[PDB]
Design a protein around this nucleic acid. Structure first.
Lengths: 140, 549, 62, 37, 83
RNA sequence: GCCAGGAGGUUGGCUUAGAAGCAGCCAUCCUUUAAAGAGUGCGUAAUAGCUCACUGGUCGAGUGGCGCCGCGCCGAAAAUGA
């Protein structure tokens, strides 16, 4: 009598392996994330893969219904600035190049994400987050 | 105290995932018990007392009768998952009589998906004959038992029909000692018939053995039967060879085989040298008595240094043998931690002056090798080059001019162990066409190595082991506990079927007898695979005390 | 006691049936191992001395 | 660690009282159980 | 937590039951032998008597068992800690 | 003390088998906000989670702490009766 289970996780693009909370909440359901490596990998045909959340349900009967989302902000510095994997200490060794430019479209793709659900604000937040990963933002 | 029904039901599908489907319901908890209600024949059964020299079908005094209905309907309703008449019959309201009920629970049972959880109490004779009749009602016979897997003389699949009219195939399993008839074998036949006095045939080590008296353990007495049946079992006398779980054929039974891949696997190894060693071969033949009346364990002889190594699954297994060890063998044993296969090395590139200023009693005899040596990563190997600055050191100082190296490698200066992880690289020498027999310069190579390691850094390498850890999560929490407590690290993890398994590094010296440790670190829900890998150094101070010479 | 030479098997038991006969080596050699006994059981791939060096029969099958 | 000539408050859960004339260290955690010994 | 007699008669895993009298100013009251209330017009007899009962039977001890006022059953790790 | 808020890029960059405020290395964002820190301890296999910090709801008068100084308290066991 498993009424509802719209349970969510942090399922990156191409990891079909249902273990907790996909075991006792979505396996206590019959949630097929096979449909996640089949209707979401195909969905994110942009490049290929990316870390993107998910949200499947069992509706008292025994159904399935899901929603997916968006890829990280440490990816947008990595596959952009030429920060191969990580700069090791974001204070001392600044590797990549993200000036006032790039960061604009960068934060653009990620607007309903973030916080202030806009784009006339979080530009300097993403361009300040550059130092969390430590990338020399050139004075444009 | 704390009797149940429910919790059992739960724990089946909360440990494995097995549907019970039940058959009867109690009349009281702890000491509230008086008899038993049943949901098959629907009969208010009840005994009287402990020994139960009085039983009866007295009415249900109320309280629980009604509940049965709800509960009992499941039975009928579960018969909608396997039967045929019961889809419609339950959609109706027409009573399924006692006849197809039997057949249906029996159905799912033999088919493997149903579980007449009849229960009861032993000491106070209450629950007995009920379960007897439960056994008949839902326990089959070799008749319902599927095609017994065996093999042909060729190597193809064969079915072993009951066939009390064809082939004469058989198995045995238990070797009971008995001063009357002698070495006895509990046998499950299979096919054919076996007369008291007939012969047979070994079916692995050909030996047309004699059967003499077919006798079944008849409770107290032992019923002597002229003939043994196609499927039925018993003890047959004789079979002076005949071991455990081995294939046995009748004189006919055209030399087939029977499968039974049946294998156990060891996990706890210990080592032993008792008294003043004068007990060794004694316990050797004693062992010959061990793994032949029952296989179980191994006597694996140490590959490197002395001592035998006694290993096997269980634990107090090894130690109950230990109990019977100083019993019918009388042997002052000191079974402790095993040895540690030790190999050592260096950590630097040094050139040494392998100078050998010598004239002896004649025949020259010297070897001045300007040698240079270097090592290699953990578990790499041993390589070299001629390193010849022209031809300084001639040909016959090749086939073994090293070997003084290879030899001295066999006992690295410090504690004396094989020296792996090295890579040489000489570079110069000095000789004479007479003052350099093969012998001489090669021995110069020996000195070269010894003083090279002496002044090239000390270091041993304790044998490291890789291992699975087959463990349900919870106590993976606990086992990461003791594993990271055991001078090592893990490095690996994936969720399997029921459980989750850890790819592991551990140090052997700090890994001994871990199967017994795991036991309660987990309550015991899986083990591992003793997967050898390589070796590392024992952080100087561990090595230090272990420097004893 | 020696063995039938060429590749052993015996670690520490075998019940080698003490056979007999020296040779100008191993200051003894007498009382040989058997290759059959309670261990050893010959050399797999011995298409010859079946009478001793183990091998039931080089049954080609294929 | 009962009975030590020095006694203290280790975390923000451990608070000292006075009882029977001797100084006592409390903290819900009994592994910090200290007394002026 | 049987209430037989005027007394509170409990069997808390000890080899025998336990017999509590209701002295002055106090009665007991067992809504069910799984939980026990005591009647009393006195704050001392409250804490003290209830204490005396929980002192009839200690709580938890690593796992979970015994008597408690209505507090928290803090635990100590099971299949470990015994080297 | 008592109600409630106790957020987002993020799972900070690195290490690291995994290090997600939270075993360590460097950290030294900015954004929605009354306020929620790249974290106070606790908790994990890492996770989860408890809690705090912080601001407003109740409440309605004094409070949190840093040194000095006078006297004590612990520190502090011995041999026939104090």
């Amino acid at each position: 009598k498993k009424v509802v289970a719209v349970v969510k996780l942090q399922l990156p693009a191409g990891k079909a392996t249902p273990a907790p909370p996909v075991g006792p909440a979505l396996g206590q359901h019959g949630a097929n994330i096979m449909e996640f490596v089949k209707a979401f990998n195909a969905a994110t045909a942009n490049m290929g893969d990316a870390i993107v959340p998910v949200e499947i349900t069992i509706y008292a009967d025994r159904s399935f219904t899901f929603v997916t989302k968006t890829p990280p902000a440490s990816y947008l510095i990595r596959k952009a600035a030429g920060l191969e994997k990580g700069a090791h200490k974001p204070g001392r060794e600044k590797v990549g190049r993200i000036t006032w430019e790039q960061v604009l479209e960068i934060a653009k793709q990620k607007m309903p994400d973030l916080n202030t659900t806009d784009l006339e604000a979080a530009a300097r937040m993403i361009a300040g987050s550059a130092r969390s990963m430590g990338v020399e933002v050139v004075g444009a | 105290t704390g009797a149940d029904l429910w919790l059992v039901i739960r724990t089946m599908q909360e440990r494995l995932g097995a549907r019970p489907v039940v058959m009867q319901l109690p009349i009281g908890r702890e000491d509230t018990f008086s008899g038993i209600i049943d949901v098959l024949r629907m009969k208010a059964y009840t005994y009287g007392n402990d020994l139960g020299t009085d039983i009866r079908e007295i009415p249900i005094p109320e309280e629980y009768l009604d509940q049965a209905r709800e509960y009992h309907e499941k039975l009928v309703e579960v018969a909608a998952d396997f039967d045929e008449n019961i889809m419609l019959k339950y959609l109706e309201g027409e009573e399924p009589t006692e006849e197809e009920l039997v057949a249906a629970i029996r159905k799912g049972t033999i088919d493997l998906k149903i579980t007449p959880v009849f229960l009861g109490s032993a000491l106070k004779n209450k629950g007995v004959q009920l379960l007897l009749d439960a056994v008949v009602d839902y326990l089959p016979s070799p008749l319902d038992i599927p095609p017994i897997k065996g093999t042909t003389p060729e190597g193809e699949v064969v079915e072993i029909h009951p066939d009390p009219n064809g082939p004469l195939a058989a198995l045995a399993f238990k070797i009971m000692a008995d001063p009357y008839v002698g070495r006895l074998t509990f046998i499950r036949v299979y096919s054919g018939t076996l007369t008291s006095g007939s012969y047979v045939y070994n079916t692995t080590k050909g030996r047309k053995e004699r059967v003499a008296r077919l006798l079944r353990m008849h409770a107290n007495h032992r019923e002597e039967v002229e003939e043994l049946k196609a499927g039925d079992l018993g003890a047959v006398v004789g079979l002076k060879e005949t071991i455990t779980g081995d294939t046995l054929v009748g004189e006919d039974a055209p030399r087939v085989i029977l499968e039974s891949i049946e294998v156990p696997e060891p996990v706890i190894d210990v080592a032993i040298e008792p008294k003043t060693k004068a007990d060794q071969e004694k316990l050797s033949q004693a062992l010959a008595r061990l793994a032949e009346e029952d296989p179980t364990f191994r006597v694996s002889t140490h590959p490197e240094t002395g001592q035998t190594i006694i290993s096997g699954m269980g634990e107090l297994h090894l130690e109950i043998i230990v109990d019977r060890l100083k019993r019918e063998f009388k042997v002052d044993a000191n079974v402790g931690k095993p040895q540690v296969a030790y190999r050592e090395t260096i950590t630097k590139p040094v050139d040494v002056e392998g100078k050998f200023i010598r004239q002896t009693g004649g025949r020259g005899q010297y070897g001045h090798v300007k040698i240079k040596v270097e090592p290699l990563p953990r578990g790499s190997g041993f390589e070299f080059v001629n390193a010849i600055v022209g031809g300084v050191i001639p040909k016959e100082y090749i086939p073994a001019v090293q070997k003084g190296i290879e030899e001295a490698m066999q006992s690295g200066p410090l504690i004396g162990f094989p020296v792996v992880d090295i890579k040489v690289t000489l570079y110069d020498g000095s000789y004479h066409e007479v003052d350099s027999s093969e012998m001489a310069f090669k021995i110069a190579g020996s000195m070269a190595i010894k003083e090279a390691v002496q002044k090239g850094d000390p270091v041993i390498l304790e044998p490291i082991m890789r291992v699975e850890v087959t463990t349900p999560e919870e106590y993976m929490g606990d086992v990461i506990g003791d594993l990271n407590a055991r001078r090592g690290q893990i490095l690996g993890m994936e969720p399997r079927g029921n459980a989750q398994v850890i790819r592991a590094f551990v140090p052997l010296a700090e890994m001994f007898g871990y199967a017994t440790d795991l036991r309660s670190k987990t309550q015991g829900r899986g083990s591992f695979v003793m997967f050898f890998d390589h070796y590392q150094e024992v952080p100087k101070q561990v090595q230090e005390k272990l420097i004893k010479g | 006691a020696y063995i039938p030479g060429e590749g052993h098997n015996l670690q520490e038991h075998s019940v080698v049936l003490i056979r007999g006969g020296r040779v100008k080596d191993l200051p003894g050699v007498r009382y040989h191992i058997v290759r059959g006994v309670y261990d050893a059981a010959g050399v797999k791939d011995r298409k010859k001395s079946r009478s001793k060096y183990g091998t039931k029969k080089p049954k080609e099958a294929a | 660690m009962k009975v030590r000539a020095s006694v203290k408050r280790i975390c923000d859960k451990c608070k000292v009282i006075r009882r029977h004339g001797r100084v006592y260290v409390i903290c819900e955690n009994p592994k910090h159980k200290q007394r002026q010994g | 937590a049987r209430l037989v007699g005027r007394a509170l008669e409990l069997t808390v895993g000890f080899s025998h039951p336990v017999v509590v009298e209701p002295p002055e100013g106090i009665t007991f009251e067992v809504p069910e032998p799984t939980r026990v209330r005591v009647s009393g017009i006195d704050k001392q007899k409250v804490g003290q008597v209830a204490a005396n009962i929980r002192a009839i039977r200690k709580p938890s001890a690593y796992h979970e068992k015994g008597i408690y006022y209505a507090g928290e059953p803090v635990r100590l790790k099971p299949g470990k800690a015994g080297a």
